[PDB]
Each structure stands twice: as structure tokens, then as C-alpha cells.
Amino acid sequence: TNLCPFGEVFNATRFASVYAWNRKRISNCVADYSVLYNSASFSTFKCYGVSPTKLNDLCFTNVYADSFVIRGDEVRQIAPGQTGKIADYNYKLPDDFTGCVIAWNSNNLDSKVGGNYNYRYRLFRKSNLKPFERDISTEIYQAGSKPCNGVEGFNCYFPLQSYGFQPTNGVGYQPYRVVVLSFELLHAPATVCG
Amino acid sequence: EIGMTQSPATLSLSPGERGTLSCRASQSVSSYLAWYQQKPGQAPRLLIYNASNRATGIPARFSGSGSGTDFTLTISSLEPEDFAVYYCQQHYNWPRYSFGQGTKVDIKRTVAAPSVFIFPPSDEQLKSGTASVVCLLNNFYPREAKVQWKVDNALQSGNSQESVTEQDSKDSTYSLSSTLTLSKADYEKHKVYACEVTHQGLSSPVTKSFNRGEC
Amino acid sequence: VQLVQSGPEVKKPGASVKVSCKASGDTFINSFFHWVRQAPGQGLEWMGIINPSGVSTTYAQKFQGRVTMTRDTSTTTFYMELSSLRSADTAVYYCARENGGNSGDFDYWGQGALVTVSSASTKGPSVFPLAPSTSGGTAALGCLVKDYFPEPVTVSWNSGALTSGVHTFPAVLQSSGLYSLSSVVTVPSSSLGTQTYICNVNHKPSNTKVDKRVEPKSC
Ligand SMILES: *[C@@H]1O[C@H](CO)[C@@H](O)[C@H](O)[C@H]1NC(C)=O
């Protein structure tokens, strides 16, 4: 093989909205995960079920690079067993998650003077999302007993709201680009990889 | 809809004490719960959102915990600035929101007996066909106090109105005024007008009185 | 970040009132707006929500068919129109921003707009003194501010020179439809006669300012 293209995900020019989170099924090699950990560019770098140093020391199959954009207060939601707007209705991590949560501030990138619609999120949902479920339905939500016929109005709301990304916003409301690395380790005797 | 219940109705603790406010939901609201502080005469102020997350600029002594149906607001060390009514609010079903009945947080002070004063109707007021006799209960604690109006040993009912002050900012005392309203011809159909007060700080009922003559 | 509401209003029973909420500072995109009222002898009561964009409102069950929430498609002014007003609708009505939704926050609130619903109209208050040789070393003096509409009335003593020991009670609504309260102050009994005591009643709604003389009078 050769090098592994983590630059395509982290250094992407544009990210997907959180409700329509992009998933990058990479499978070329293993890169030096110990290189990405000590990178000061990433402020949130939390791993689960495995230590960051031993990722290159371990062995897995498909490694999914989930990437999307949320706000600073919603960063702590990208974690197992959390709830809220994002964790329940946009991107859900399982209780037995095996991977890492990488996040960094993207106010210098995804914010525009006067707001930045673009990035959106699913407001509500009849039930909480399954783990790794992507809901991209743009159907008008029927909050009352009267049908909506796809019309916005009373008890008929558009299920997606746009983030209002301005540079003058507080850091808790600033855009944060998140990369969720999910990979399925092998099942060898505790000698080869264990 | 979802019903929210806060307990206790009133919590009275000294500065530095640990405060625990409960909020119980009629059904599971997941972590969809928010706490608020409203100081007197002010608009409410968010303290905790999503059950356990501290809002921006909120002092560290405020924290929240709980999920589903039972929620708890904890003030690790109460300060005088925390005298307020605290409301919880649900939002599990996005369109609608309901509030708890509120728990008024008082700065606990030792029980104190009220200083009682009685006031006959005035000269100028009697020129109008109405008479108002006021009984004052000044500086006391707790807020609970019973006021009974008697005219010639006959108890009155339905003809009086009470008014209670907010908790004083310096000595945490309350003040109460009860206004008995009767017609002018009725005020001269009787001689003695008394005001009997009973309170936790009193070992026996206290009564201040006056006769129609005297002055 | 600033939320500015309209001035207070008084309405007859059955009429309608429209409260404005002018907002500035932060992008109101991605920020919903609510309306919550607080009755004088009650807690917070949620009324409804309107989204930043085109209506898509939700009203509480108790206000279904009575409230209409709109926007000013320019000044980012959010309106709350309440029809068929009754005496119980007398309350302070707040507007509040909610980021995101669901959870969100009531981060910032308005100052509140008092709506007073009653059949009566603006009326000046009548003030009567309240005075006791008392029975103890402390004497009590007060002013009875009776029969005025609408709230509030402001009372000071000796043009503000007397502050400690002053207790002004909140107004009480009467069967006549008017408000009445009392403002008292505890002073040393031996000060009666030495210092002159005057209460300063000010009721701006009726352009009324009264300064009665609170001094005991043995007959
Ligand atoms: C992205 O590119 C910058 C330079 O353009 C580099 O410093 C950084 O390491 C890159 N990130 C990744 C994950 O390759």
C-alpha cells in the first residue's frame, strides 16, 4: 500500500451538515494515529474502548470517518450515552462505541459576516435515532391533528433549521468540525494484535 | 400534557448551606429539562439546560442532575444573591413547554416574633362612606401568620384583605398588613376593635386593640 | 443582544392587545422566540412559540384560538396578540429567545410588558394617614393609598430622607375594581413631635402626587 488519506477528511474544504453527516469508508492502510493525537489543531480528542497511542498498535477492518459540523455546546454530545438535539435527532453514538471523537474550532472557516445558513440540523423527531442512523427526510412535521400537505404553517414546521454562524457569536455557538473514527477490530488470539 | 412538580414548595437555608431543589415530571422527558432563576421584579434567568449543563456565565455553585422523570437543582453554597423563585421547564415534545410551580428559596433566619400595631380609620376617610382599620405585623419569620378580626368579641370573615412583603434584603424579615373594610355606619355600631395575632415566634396569642372613643 | 418590548397597556374586558418585542444584536436566524406571562399572584406560564422564519407557530392549549403571534418581516419585531381579554389575562408578558430549539435556552429575556384588563379606567388615589402615646418604645406610622387604577403607585417619606424601617405593601385589587395598598415606617416613639413625617404618594397614570401628613393626634 502507501500513505493513508486522512487529509481528505480533516482538510476537506466543505463539511456536511450534522443531520446529513458524511461517512468516509476508508480501507487503504493504517496511518500513524500517534501523529494526529499530539496535533495541537484538535482541541477535543477523546477515544473510547482503546487508547490513542495503541491505535497503530491495533488491527481493525473497515474504519468509518464520519464528518459533520455542529456548534461548540453540542461537541460534548458526540459521545456514548448522551442525549439532546444532536445525539437524539442527528448523529447518535452507541453505548458500546469503539473509536475516537475528534473536534476542532472552525469559526475561521464556516462562519460568515451576517450568518451562514448552509449547515443545518434536524430539530425534532418522533423517536430518538438509532446509532449511526442518518435521517435526511425533509418532510414537514405534523405537530397537530391536522395534516400539513407539505405546507409550512401552524403545527407544520420544516424539520431542519440552519445554524446562524457569525464570527461575533459566543464560542459556545461557534462552528465545530467533528470527525468520528469508528473501526471494527479483528478477533484474533491475544498474540497477533492482543 | 406533561405535568411538572417541584419539591419542596419553599426551602429555607442559611448562607453557605447546601441547597437541593427537586423537579418531578409526570412522564419521561429524557434529558429535556431546564432550570431558571427569577429574582424579584426581574425576568427569569436560565441556570441549567439539558438537565446537567451549566449556561454561560452561570456561577459554579449551580449544578443540575437527573434524567427521565426526576431532576435535581443543587446550589453547593447558597449566597444572599440567590434569594429567588426557581422554575424547571420541560420540552421533550418540541412544540410545547410547561413550567413547574416554582420553589421559593429563602435565606433562613431564626424564628422572630412580629411587632404588632393597630390603626383606626382616619378622619378624612370617614367623610367617604368607607372605613379602613389596618393591623400591621412588622418584621417576622416564617411568612405564615394568622390574623383574626374581632368586633365586640365577634369574629369577622370575608371583610378583610392581607398583603405580604417580599423577604427583606438585610434582615430577611417579612411585613404584613390586613385591611378590614366596613361601612361608616357600621364602624360606629361597635366600640372595641382588636387584632389578634398568632405566630411561631409567639408563645401566646398577641392582641392589640382600641375603643371607638379614647383618641 | 437586546430585547425591547412595547410600553404597558390597559384594556377593557373583551378587547385585544398586541405586545411588540423589538430585538437587535445577534442573528435571530437559528433563534426561536417564545411568549411567557406571569400573573401577579402566580408563576411563569408558557403561551407559545414562533420560529425566526414564516410563522409555523405553536400555541398553548389554554390559548388555542385566542393568541396570534406574528413578525414584522423587517425590524425583527415579534408580536403577541391576545383576543377576548378577561380579568385573568392581567399579567406581565415576556418575550424570550431560544437558540437551536427543543432544549435550547431562555438565554435572554425582555423587560416585560404589563397588560391590565378591567372595566375601570384611570383614577387618582385617595391617601389617608395612619397613626397610633404608644405602648412601647417604638411607634408606627403609615399612609393608606386607596382606590386608584392602574398600578403602580410609588411612595417615599420625607422626600426620600426616611428609608430604613419603611415597608410599602404591594397593591391589592378591590371588589370595586381598583387597587389599594399601605406604606408604613417604624420610628422611635420619642421622635413623634420632634421630626415632621410626610409620605410622598406619586401616581403617574393619573398625574397624581399626594403628600399627606402622618402624625399622631391625641384628642
Ligand atoms: C491539513 O493541512 C495542513 C497544512 O495545509 C497540515 O498542517 C495538517 O497536518 C493537515 N491535516 C491532516 C489531517 O493531514
Residue numbers in the entry:
A (entry chain C): 333 to 526
B (entry chain L): 1 to 215
C (entry chain H): 2 to 133, 137 to 223
Sentences from the study reporting this entry:
In this paper we have generated a panel of 28 potent human monoclonal antibodies from BA.4 or BA.5 infected volunteers. 26 mAb binds to the RBD and 2 to the NTD. To achieve this, mutations are targeted at the sites of binding of potent mAbs, most of which bind either on or in close proximity to the ACE2 interacting surface of the RBD and are exemplified by the Fab/RBD structures we present for four representative mAbs. Our structures show that the four most broadly neutralizing anti-BA.4/5 mAbs have substantial (12–21 residues) overlap with the ACE2 footprint.
BA.4/5-9 (IGVH1-46) is bound similarly to BA.4/5-1 with its HC sitting on top of the neck of the RBD but rotated by about 35° such that the LC is located at the back rather than at the back of the left shoulder as in BA.4/5-1, making a footprint of 1210 Å2 (770 Å2 by HC, 440 Å2 by LC). CDR-H3 contacts L455 and F456 through G101 and N103, while contacts to F456 from CDR-L3 are extensive, mainly from the main chain atoms of residues 92-94 and the Cβ of W94. Interestingly, BA.4/5-9 is not sensitive to the F456L mutation of XBB.1.5.10 but is sensitive to L455S in JN.1 whilst the L455F and F456L double mutation knocks out the activity of the mAb. CDR-H2 is located directly on top of Q493 making a single contact through P53 to the latter, and the Q493R mutation found in BA.1, BA.2 and some subvariants thereof diminishes the neutralization ability of BA.4/5-9. CDR-L1 interacts extensively with residues 415–416 and 420–421 none of which are in the ACE2 footprint and have not yet shown significant mutations. Mutations of many of these footprint residues (417, 445–446, 460, 477, 484, 486, 498, 501 and 505) have no effect on these mAbs, whilst other mutations show moderate effects (3- to 7-fold for G476S in BS.1 variant on BA.4/5-1, BA.4/5-2 and BA.4/5-35) or target just one of the mAbs, (A475V impacts BA.4/5-35 and Q493R knocks out BA.4/5-9). However, all four Fabs have close contact with residues 455 and 456 and the L455F and F456L double “FLip” mutations, present in some of the recent fastest spreading variants, knock out all of them.
